[PDB]
Amino acid sequence: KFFVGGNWKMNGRKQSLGELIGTLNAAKVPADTEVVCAPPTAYIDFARQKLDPKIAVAAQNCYKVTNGAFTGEISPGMIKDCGATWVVLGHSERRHVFGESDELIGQKVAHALAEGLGVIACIGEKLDEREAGITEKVVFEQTKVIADNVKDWSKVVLAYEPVWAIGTGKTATPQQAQEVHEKLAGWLKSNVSDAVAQSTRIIYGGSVTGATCKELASQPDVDGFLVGGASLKPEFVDIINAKQ
């Protein structure tokens, strides 16, 4: 199933997000497409209440124990208690703005999965890493740490973020995304199963719009999207329709 995730990031209030959710509830979700929305943490509850059950909800981050002295964090069990079924982990903003290490992200992955959430596990290389020629190394290491903490890939989606194209002056073509997605899909096929490679969705977390979504979705190993800014707009419906 084609996977379309909307990452609202740190945006919206009850009013604007209620309007957005109204637009999404009205949209026909294709039968072959699974749609997930990641609202700001203070609105997970609100969003799950207002969104139609056909759209799943995701938390944007979580910590690695079920309860503890971690002022300002939330646990997978709280996410589940609010009706959310996924959590985004390892987002480039968590890694580079807030310094989340690979080890911490892997431990969060293991805990989210053990508590029965699905996980959208994000990876990607920065500009200087790409230009130094070690896209391979960075992306494989980050995927290794995630895989070390994944026992059932049924509940996991891997999101490649071309961090090197975020505000840097360079952008990623569809072919470049397909290049990296194929190299990742070889890893999974190589280090897990052939069935897991056919099963596991590798989604693209770069810049995607209504105008570009169809060409990118046509790439053989692009199996979905983790959408940023467009996720707050009616244009997100076009990206839901990428495969139609």
Residues in contact with Na ion by CB under 5 A are: 102, 105, 142, 145, 190-191, 222
Work out how close the CB of 242 gets to Br ion at its nearest, in angstroms, rounded to a whole number: 16
Residue 9 counted as an annotated binding residue: yes
Sign of the four-CA dihedral 150, 156, 160, 163 = negative
Q: In terms of residues, how long is the chain?
A: 244
Catalog residues that contact its own copies under the rule CB under 8 A: 7, 9-14, 38, 40-46, 59-61, 63, 65, 67-75, 77-79, 81-82, 88, 91, 93-94, 97-99, 228-229
Catalog residues that contact Br ion under the rule CB under 5 A: 7, 226, 228
> Which is closer to its own copies, CB of 46 or CB of 187?
46
> Which is closer to Br ion, CB of 120 or CB of 197?
120
CB 122 within 8 A of CB 161: yes
CB 221 within 8 A of CB 202: yes
> Which is closer to Br ion, CB of 148 or CB of 229?
229
Work out how close the CB of 111 gets to Na ion at its nearest, in angstroms, rounded to a whole number: 14
Distance CA 234, CA 49 (A): 20
Residue 127: which residues within 8 A CB-CB, separation 6 or more?
A: 163, 164, 168, 170
* 226 DSSP β-pair partners: 5
Residue 7 counted as an annotated binding residue: yes
- Report the greatest alpha carbon distance in the chain: 47
Q: Phi first, then psi: what are they for 47, rounded to 5°?
A: -65, -40
- The option from its own copies, Na ion, Br ion, none interacting with 142 (CB < 5 to 8 A, set by class) reads Na ion
* Of 36, 42, 52, residue with least CA distance to 14: 42
Work out how close the CB of 59 gets to Br ion at its nearest, in angstroms, rounded to a whole number: 14
- The option from Br ion, its own copies, Na ion, none interacting with 164 (CB < 5 to 8 A, set by class) reads none
Sign of the four-CA dihedral 173, 126, 64, 145 = positive
- The option from its own copies, Br ion, Na ion, none interacting with 78 (CB < 5 to 8 A, set by class) reads its own copies
Q: Which residues are catalytic?
A: 91, 161
Work out how close the CB of 161 gets to Na ion at its nearest, in angstroms, rounded to a whole number: 12
- The option from Br ion, its own copies, Na ion, none interacting with 19 (CB < 5 to 8 A, set by class) reads none
Work out how close the CB of 172 gets to its own copies at its nearest, in angstroms, rounded to a whole number: 17
> Which is closer to its own copies, CB of 3 or CB of 43?
43
Distance CA 158, CA 144 (A): 12
Q: Which two tokens stand for residue 182?
A: 């194929």
> Binding site for substrate: residue ranges?
7, 9
